[PDB]
């Protein structure tokens, strides 16, 4: 399996209510492992998974120190940007940063990414080159010359090919119990009369990690069912994920359609068809 | 933690000075050499963050993150490179410093002329001091062992105009029996004029 | 530098005095700011780290405090100095964020804390005229200066020719020596040499002066001793050209 | 491990 | 500026069984800005102790958030999540439904 470490950062200005709300979260794959919240009484970076709790004081001190310096950058930028866009001091705006590193089955570096957003739109994105910047509008171009001048891309590259993939691997080891598990879908199926002419079959996949998965139907033909009601995969909130796909079928051909679940946790792709 | 050797690390004028700095924290993400002349504040000479070499004039750093050191080589060392060299490592937004590496670049006296002279005080003829000058950078000077006698370590002039650099050392003492003849005794002395005019 | 100033530069103060050091910074906005100390060796210990105005972080517990009233004004203070607080206090700033991590330093504040100010003495200062031998053998002339009997161990020696500061042909000792290498509270000594061509020392309308800036007590310090008060002061000796 | 590099004003 | 209407999904952690403790999840995704009023209801009647995931977001920068409380279900009790956001003309109330 490919793996990924991702840091997500959210700063919301709220003038007259004091300093901007700042929420940092760390993920490895689909497992959140740290968080910061400027509004919690801690003012520390804090664990959100068992395997990171085993790191010592210098790690928490450091992640706390770094995370606060990210939140301070964002404080300045809510100001600078409000300026660049000629917006008033009243009214609340959002800055979002995301960055991390992919690795493949070899745990070797694969890609790196670092993007910024103002008010839910792309502001500045590092390209896959880990060197070139894409800039949305005349304003992002100003940030672009600033960052090119100071070789921000070089610095991030260092982190992104260096520290990022190293500590990703260090987490994948320490947390082998959590992170390199593969919980297979527990799967049932449901029936529902819609008409005298039409039924509904639902393919349930519940209690699977990681969250990547494929639910697809067919019958009498390898070519799937073109059109299918499938829901966005959703966190069960215990650590696993859930998802169904469902299709509408003739009263006649109930037990003729079949559902095809694919998942790293499945030695071979599962296959199911209706039975009372 | 960041470790660098205390000098004094002595290197001849024109040679390469090799300074080293180890560190233990796998959290480390950037690396710095500062130069601090005595009495003064450190000024940055090098920052590096990718494994490799980085060269600025006569300075080259080598970062190795696997072997966990960062080097500084000063090729073509001047005596004005004499300074304390501070290594610093960014762990988690905190620059931690080693206790520094002292570097003396011993100058190269092309036309040495060892001599011990007697200078008199302009205000009183009586009060008297011995200057031992014009020796070359292989000669060393030792602290006195006559309790009442005060000797300085060697000290590099530089008359940029005349094109001439002079090593000098000074002894003096508040007793009659003190002469220049045997003051820089207790040190290993070449073949110096002890002018018999005084 | 010009991006970062810092005062006062040098301080002699008895155990239990209060301390105020100020650091201005100009030409950047929203810097990180740092209080470093250098003592008992070279090598900087981080005392205070400040990610923004009013936000301070203490990195080791201590009888010192700091505050950042403005974006570009940082203060370090004590209500009561201990001996241990002796040191070279350095202010530094760093670009908003986690950039490269480059620290730009102020010119530092040197703090010596003493148990007993009765020990403090300014330097006695003599210049010694070149030897007639040196002049005939070398066609050259080495003036020597001798700052003796001073405590604590910090002065700055300078050479002045015809009332302008020469840097060329100077060597000063880069550390003073102990007059009584035995004691703790011994007084100290320091030499400098100025060398000139024999026919510049011989020009009788040439003025040679040795200046020694000493750092001692301030005007509002207690003093019980019979002798005048060893304050911050400049001590000089001098000599004129001699064509004989 | 958070980046200690390349986190810079806009 | 983009603002984005939240999507909502109401479901249990483990497949519903009456008189058996469980967790009721209301999962809001695809919204901007982050300010969002989310409440869990019992019979129409607000639950008091409701916790939420830490705030995170997708590639499109749209926020997601999972509100949950510990609950035991039963065939008479009609559970619902009510969500309000500046993008909504007025609160969307979505009803929980086993097999959905």
């Amino acid at each position: 399996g490919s793996h990924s470490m991702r840091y997500f950062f959210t700063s919301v200005s709220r003038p007259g209510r004091g300093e901007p709300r700042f929420i940092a979260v760390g993920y490895v794959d689909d497992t959140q492992f740290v968080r910061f919240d400027s509004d919690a009484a801690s003012q520390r970076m804090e664990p959100r998974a068992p395997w990171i709790e085993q790191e010592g004081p210098e790690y928490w001190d450091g992640e706390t120190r770094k995370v606060k310096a990210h939140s301070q950058t964002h404080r300045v930028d809510l100001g600078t940007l409000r300026g660049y866009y000629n917006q008033s001091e009243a009214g609340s705006h959002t800055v979002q940063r995301m960055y991390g590193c992919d690795v493949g089955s070899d745990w070797r570096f694969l890609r790196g990414y670092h993007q910024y957003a103002y008010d839910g739109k792309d502001y500045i994105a590092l390209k896959e080159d880990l060197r070139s910047w894409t800039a949305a509008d005349m304003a992002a171009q100003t940030t672009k010359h600033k960052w090119e001048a100071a070789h921000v891309a070089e610095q991030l590259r260092a982190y992104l090919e260096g520290t990022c993939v190293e500590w990703l691997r260090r987490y994948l080891e320490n947390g082998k119990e959590t992170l390199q598990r593969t919980d297979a879908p527990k799967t049932h199926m449901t029936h529902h009369a819609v008409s005298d002419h039409e039924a509904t079959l639902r393919c349930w996949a519940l209690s699977f990690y990681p969250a990547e998965i494929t639910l697809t139907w067919q019958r009498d033909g390898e070519d799937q069912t073109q059109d299918t009601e499938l829901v966005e995969t959703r966190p069960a909130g215990d650590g696993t994920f859930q998802k169904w796909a469902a299709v509408v079928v003739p009263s006649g051909q109930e037990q003729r359609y079949t559902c095809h679940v694919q998942h790293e946790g499945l030695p071979k792709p599962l296959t199911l068809r209706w039975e009372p | 933690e960041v470790e660098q050797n205390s000098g004094p690390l002595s290197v001849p004028e024109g040679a390469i000075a090799s300074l080293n700095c180890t560190y233990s924290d796998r959290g480390s993400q950037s690396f710095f050499w500062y130069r601090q002349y005595s009495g003064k504040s450190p000024e940055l000479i090098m920052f590096i963050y990718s494994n490799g070499d980085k060269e600025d004039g006569r300075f080259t750093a080598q970062l190795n993150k696997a072997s966990q050191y960062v080097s500084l080589l000063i090729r073509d060392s001047q005596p004005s490179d004499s300074a304390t060299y501070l290594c610093a490592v960014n762990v988690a937004g905190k620059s931690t410093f080693g206790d520094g590496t002292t570097l003396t670049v011993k100058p190269n006296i092309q036309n040495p002329d060892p001599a011990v002279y007697q200078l008199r005080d302009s205000k009183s003829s009586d009060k008297s001091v011995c200057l031992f000058t014009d020796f070359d950078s292989q000669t060393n000077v030792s602290q006195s062992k006559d309790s009442d006698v005060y000797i300085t370590d060697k000290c590099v002039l530089d008359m940029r105009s005349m094109d001439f650099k002079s090593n000098s050392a000074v002894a003096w003492s508040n007793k009659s029996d003190f002469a220049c003849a045997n003051a820089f005794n207790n040190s290993i002395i070449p073949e110096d004029t002890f002018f018999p005019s005084p | 530098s010009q991006t970062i100033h810092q005062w006062p530069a040098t301080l002699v103060q008895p155990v239990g005095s209060p301390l105020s050091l100020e650091c201005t910074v100009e030409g950047t906005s929203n810097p990180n700011l740092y209080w470093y100390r250098q003592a008992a060796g070279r090598g900087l210990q981080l005392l205070f780290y400040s990610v923004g105005i009013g936000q301070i972080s203490s990195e080791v517990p201590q009888n010192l405090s700091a505050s950042r009233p403005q974006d570009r004004q940082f203060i370090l203070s004590s209500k009561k100095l201990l001996l241990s607080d002796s040191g070279f206090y350095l202010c530094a700033w760093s670009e908003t964020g986690l950039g490269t991590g480059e620290l730009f330093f102020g010119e530092g504040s040197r703090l010596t804390v003493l148990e007993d100010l009765k020990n403090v003495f300014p330097p006695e200062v003599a210049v010694f005229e070149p030897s007639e031998a040196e002049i005939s053998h070398t066609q050259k002339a080495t003036l020597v200066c001798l700052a003796t009997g001073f405590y604590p161990d910090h002065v700055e020696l300078s050479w002045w020719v015809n009332g302008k500061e020469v840097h060329s042909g100077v060597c000063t000792d880069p550390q003073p020596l102990k007059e009584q290498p035995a004691l703790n509270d011994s007084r100290y000594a320091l030499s400098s040499r100025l060398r000139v061509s024999a026919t510049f020392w011989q020009d009788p309308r040439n003025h040679f002066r040795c200046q020694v800036q000493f750092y001692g007590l301030s005007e509002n310090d207690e003093w019980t001793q019979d002798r005048a008060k060893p304050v911050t002061q400049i001590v000089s000796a001098e000599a004129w050209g001699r064509a004989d | 491990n958070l980046s200690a590099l390349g986190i810079f004003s806009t | 500026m983009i603002q984005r209407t939240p999507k909502i999904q109401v479901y249990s952690r483990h497949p519903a069984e009456n008189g058996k403790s469980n967790f009721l999840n209301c999962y809001v995704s695809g919204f901007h800005p982050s300010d969002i009023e989310v409440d869990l209801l019992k019979n129409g009647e607000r639950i008091e102790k409701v916790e939420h995931s830490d705030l995170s977001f997708s590639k499109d920068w749209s926020f997601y958030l999972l509100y949950y409380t510990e609950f035991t279900p039963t065939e008479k009790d009609e559970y619902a999540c009510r969500v309000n956001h500046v993008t909504l003309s007025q609160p969307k109330i979505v009803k929980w439904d086993r097999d959905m």
Side-chain angles (χ1 to χ4, degrees):
Chain A
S2 296
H3 301 279
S4 37
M5 184 157 83
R6 288 162 176 145
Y7 283 107
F8 308 78
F9 308 83
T10 311
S11 262
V12 171
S13 81
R14 60 212 177 162
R17 283 140 292 161
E19 279 299 321
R21 184 59 176 281
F22 172 82
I23 307 185
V25 295
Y27 284 88
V28 171
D29 305 339
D30 306 338
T31 309
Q32 176 190 1
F33 70 100
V34 295
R35 61 115 177 182
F36 191 79
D37 185 339
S38 70
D39 280 24
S42 207
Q43 290 302 119
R44 305 280 298 158
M45 183 84 76
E46 328 178 60
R48 286 307 271 241
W51 44 265
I52 204 62
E53 264 180 56
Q54 76 176 94
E55 307 277 355
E58 286 86 353
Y59 176 83
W60 295 102
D61 289 348
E63 298 303 308
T64 290
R65 191 163 30 234
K66 270 177 284 152
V67 89
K68 295 205 288 171
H70 293 234
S71 111
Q72 191 65 24
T73 311
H74 281 3
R75 282 194 189 173
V76 167
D77 300 339
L78 287 156
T80 291
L81 276 183
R82 168 193 55 74
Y84 286 165
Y85 285 102
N86 267 177
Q87 292 161 321
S88 78
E89 316 290 11
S92 162
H93 302 91
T94 312
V95 156
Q96 287 158 287
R97 190 182 307 267
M98 179 273 247
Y99 67 64
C101 47
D102 300 348
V103 300
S105 323
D106 63 348
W107 288 17
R108 189 173 165 172
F109 172 100
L110 194 28
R111 73 193 62 84
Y113 36 81
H114 175 284
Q115 31 211 24
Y116 199 101
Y118 191 57
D119 290 330
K121 268 162 175 305
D122 291 342
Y123 187 62
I124 206 167
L126 199 47
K127 298 221 189 156
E128 229 196 304
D129 317 16
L130 304 177
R131 174 191 182 175
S132 299
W133 299 101
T134 102
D137 46 26
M138 208 36 249
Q141 301 290 165
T142 291
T143 287
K144 206 180 106 166
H145 303 343
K146 205 158 168 314
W147 281 11
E148 283 184 340
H151 317 283
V152 178
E154 293 32 48
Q155 298 182 49
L156 283 172
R157 210 198 144 202
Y159 164 73
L160 276 175
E161 287 205 35
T163 323
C164 197
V165 311
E166 280 151 351
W167 288 82
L168 176 43
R169 295 163 195 157
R170 175 212 186 102
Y171 304 147
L172 289 162
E173 259 145 3
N174 300 154
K176 168 164 187 161
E177 296 295 333
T178 299
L179 300 177
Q180 302 178 207
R181 88 190 160 197
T182 188
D183 306 6
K186 296 157 161 146
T187 60
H188 57 96
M189 199 190 300
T190 68
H191 194 231
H192 293 77
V194 168
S195 319
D196 309 358
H197 309 290
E198 298 179 316
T200 271
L201 291 183
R202 210 167 319 270
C203 210
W204 285 92
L206 306 174
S207 256
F208 64 90
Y209 178 100
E212 176 202 42
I213 206 163
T214 315
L215 304 176
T216 183
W217 287 87
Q218 41 187 116
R219 75 118 164 187
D220 302 11
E222 163 64 327
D223 296 310
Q224 90 298 7
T225 63
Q226 180 79 73
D227 300 60
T228 306
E229 186 190 11
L230 79 170
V231 285
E232 148 167 7
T233 312
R234 67 210 203 181
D238 68 356
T240 79
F241 297 89
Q242 300 174 175
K243 175 184 246 269
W244 55 257
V247 61
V248 155
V249 299
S251 299
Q253 295 107 81
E254 297 282 334
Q255 316 174 261
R256 180 73 71 175
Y257 293 78
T258 170
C259 178
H260 279 97
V261 192
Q262 300 169 64
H263 196 257
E264 291 169 78
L266 289 184
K268 67 174 176 183
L270 275 192
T271 203
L272 326 160
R273 66 211 318 158
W274 180 238
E275 172 45 51
Chain B
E1 179 139 25
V2 311
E3 305 173 75
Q4 62 180 311
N5 291 339
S6 70
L9 193 184
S10 202
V11 48
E13 177 161 42
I16 308 174
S18 55
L19 307 150
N20 200 33
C21 181
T22 92
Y23 66 87
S24 34
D25 204 305
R26 293 307 313 198
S28 295
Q29 289 183 55
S30 51
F31 302 92
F32 309 81
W33 286 99
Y34 294 86
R35 187 180 52 213
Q36 181 179 218
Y37 299 113
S38 92
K40 254 84 154 79
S41 66
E43 87 223 294
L44 175 74
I45 65 187
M46 277 268 162
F47 77 91
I48 184 176
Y49 42 82
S50 262
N51 291 335
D53 303 333
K54 176 172 190 188
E55 173 212 54
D56 193 23
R58 295 178 303 108
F59 297 118
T60 310
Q62 189 181 86
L63 175 71
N64 190 335
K65 297 220 299 160
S67 285
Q68 276 172 244
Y69 64 82
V70 61
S71 311
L72 186 73
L73 299 213
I74 304 163
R75 91 164 165 71
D76 216 332
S77 296
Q78 309 306 310
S80 84
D81 290 342
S82 293
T84 293
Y85 289 83
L86 277 308
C87 178
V89 181
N90 176 30
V91 210
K94 186 181 68 164
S95 296
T96 311
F97 285 89
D99 314 345
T101 303
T102 299
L103 172 71
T104 331
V105 175
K106 277 177 307 165
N108 165 225
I109 303 323
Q110 78 177 231
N111 292 106
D113 194 346
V116 172
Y117 303 108
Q118 184 173 37
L119 319 190
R120 292 325 186 89
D121 171 37
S122 49
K123 299 84 168 27
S124 70
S125 141
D126 193 314
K127 294 310 309 167
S128 177
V129 142
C130 296
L131 169 61
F132 159 48
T133 192
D134 283 32
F135 55 95
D136 68 297
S137 296
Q138 272 82 322
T139 310
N140 281 1
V141 187
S142 41
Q143 53 171 82
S144 183
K145 283 283 178 302
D146 204 36
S147 185
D148 266 302
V149 182
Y150 311 105
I151 303 167
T152 97
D153 190 40
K154 61 170 151 146
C155 198
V156 192
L157 290 140
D158 197 311
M159 306 189 282
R160 289 87 191 159
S161 60
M162 296 287 267
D163 194 358
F164 190 89
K165 318 197 287 161
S166 154
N167 282 323
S168 13
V170 184
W172 76 85
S173 191
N174 315 22
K175 50 212 297 195
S176 311
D177 69 298
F178 181 85
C180 288
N182 60 11
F184 294 100
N185 212 1
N186 197 227
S187 300
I188 298 85
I189 297 301
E191 272 45 43
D192 341 349
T193 358
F194 280 86
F195 282 96
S197 46
Chain C
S1 46
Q2 291 205 149
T3 69
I4 169 162
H5 188 207
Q6 169 179 1
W7 75 86
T10 298
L11 299 118
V12 193
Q13 266 173 230
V15 168
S17 46
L19 171 79
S20 165
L21 311 167
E22 293 232 29
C23 183
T24 307
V25 41
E26 193 172 12
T28 187
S29 69
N30 302 297
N32 300 261
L33 289 185
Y34 307 86
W35 274 118
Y36 275 107
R37 179 165 150 247
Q38 191 173 235
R42 300 300 188 87
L44 311 198
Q45 190 193 20
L46 182 56
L47 290 187
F48 296 110
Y49 158 52
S50 176
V51 61
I53 188 158
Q55 329 184 216
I56 261 67
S57 192
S58 191
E59 299 286 344
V60 70
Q62 48 184 321
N63 209 52
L64 307 152
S65 99
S67 97
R68 186 173 181 181
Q70 296 178 94
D71 179 36
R72 295 199 267 111
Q73 169 181 52
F74 201 38
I75 290 83
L76 181 81
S77 56
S78 201
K79 300 192 165 178
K80 280 204 306 194
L81 293 167
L82 315 77
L83 281 186
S84 73
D85 288 341
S86 262
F88 190 56
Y89 285 89
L90 280 161
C91 183
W93 78 261
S94 138
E95 292 284 300
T96 313
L98 314 159
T100 70
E102 286 173 67
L103 303 167
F104 309 72
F105 280 99
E107 51 279 86
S109 296
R110 171 166 290 110
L111 165 61
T112 321
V113 175
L114 296 167
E115 340 177 21
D116 204 337
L117 305 192
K118 86 168 177 219
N119 283 146
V120 171
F121 294 83
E124 271 162 310
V125 170
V127 301
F128 298 79
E129 299 188 330
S131 83
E132 182 179 353
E134 199 220 306
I135 304 171
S136 49
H137 194 273
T138 340
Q139 306 149 46
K140 276 168 210 167
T142 306
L143 287 153
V144 143
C145 193
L146 213 62
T148 69
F150 71 78
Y151 188 99
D153 72 11
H154 204 277
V155 305
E156 308 144 357
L157 200 152
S158 73
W159 279 100
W160 291 78
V161 180
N162 304 321
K164 282 215 277 288
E165 199 187 336
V166 299
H167 298 292
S168 196
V170 173
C171 205
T172 297
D173 302 321
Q175 52 186 313
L177 70 73
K178 284 199 194 177
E179 301 207 313
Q180 302 189 43
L183 283 283
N184 346 67
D185 46 311
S186 154
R187 299 151 66 171
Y188 290 90
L190 190 95
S191 69
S192 196
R193 323 95 173 90
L194 172 57
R195 209 159 209 208
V196 285
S197 83
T199 49
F200 192 89
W201 168 246
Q202 260 148 42
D203 192 1
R205 50 174 187 70
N206 269 335
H207 189 85
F208 295 104
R209 196 199 339 129
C210 183
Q211 251 174 224
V212 177
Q213 172 60 265
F214 173 61
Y215 300 86
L217 311 190
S218 74
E219 83 167 32
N220 42 352
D221 250 325
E222 300 165 9
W223 192 255
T224 317
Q225 300 292 128
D226 221 37
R227 64 180 169 99
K229 184 164 90 190
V231 293
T232 301
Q233 55 189 106
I234 295 164
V235 191
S236 307
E238 48 162 41
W240 288 83
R242 188 175 177 163
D244 207 1
Chain D
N1 208 275
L2 272 303
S3 185
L5 300 176
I7 308 304
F8 206 99
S9 277
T10 270
Chain E
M1 176 93 54
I2 177 151
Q3 323 187 302
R4 317 176 95 106
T5 310
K7 314 290 92 195
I8 312 96
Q9 296 207 47
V10 191
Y11 59 96
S12 60
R13 182 185 293 185
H14 310 266
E17 274 185 32
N18 301 25
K20 319 302 164 218
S21 84
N22 191 332
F23 288 83
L24 177 78
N25 296 323
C26 169
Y27 178 67
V28 200
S29 82
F31 64 95
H32 208 95
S34 26
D35 276 306
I36 206 177
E37 280 182 23
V38 180
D39 275 278
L40 289 185
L41 303 184
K42 190 174 180 225
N43 298 314
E45 198 65 28
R46 206 183 77 107
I47 312 223
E48 190 198 354
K49 175 185 300 188
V50 180
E51 295 170 9
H52 61 278
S53 83
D54 303 283
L55 176 69
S56 204
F57 53 89
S58 302
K59 300 301 203 176
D60 71 5
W61 302 107
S62 85
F63 295 100
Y64 64 88
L65 220 39
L66 177 90
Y67 295 85
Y68 60 95
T69 189
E70 178 154 338
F71 98 134
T72 95
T74 219
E75 204 175 357
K76 52 189 175 53
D77 290 304
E78 177 163 3
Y79 285 99
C81 172
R82 160 187 48 163
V83 164
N84 193 230
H85 187 271
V86 283
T87 38
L88 290 186
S89 45
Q90 69 144 67
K92 229 152 191 45
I93 333 105
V94 173
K95 261 150 209 175
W96 177 46
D97 181 21
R98 310 148 182 219
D99 271 334
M100 180 86 186

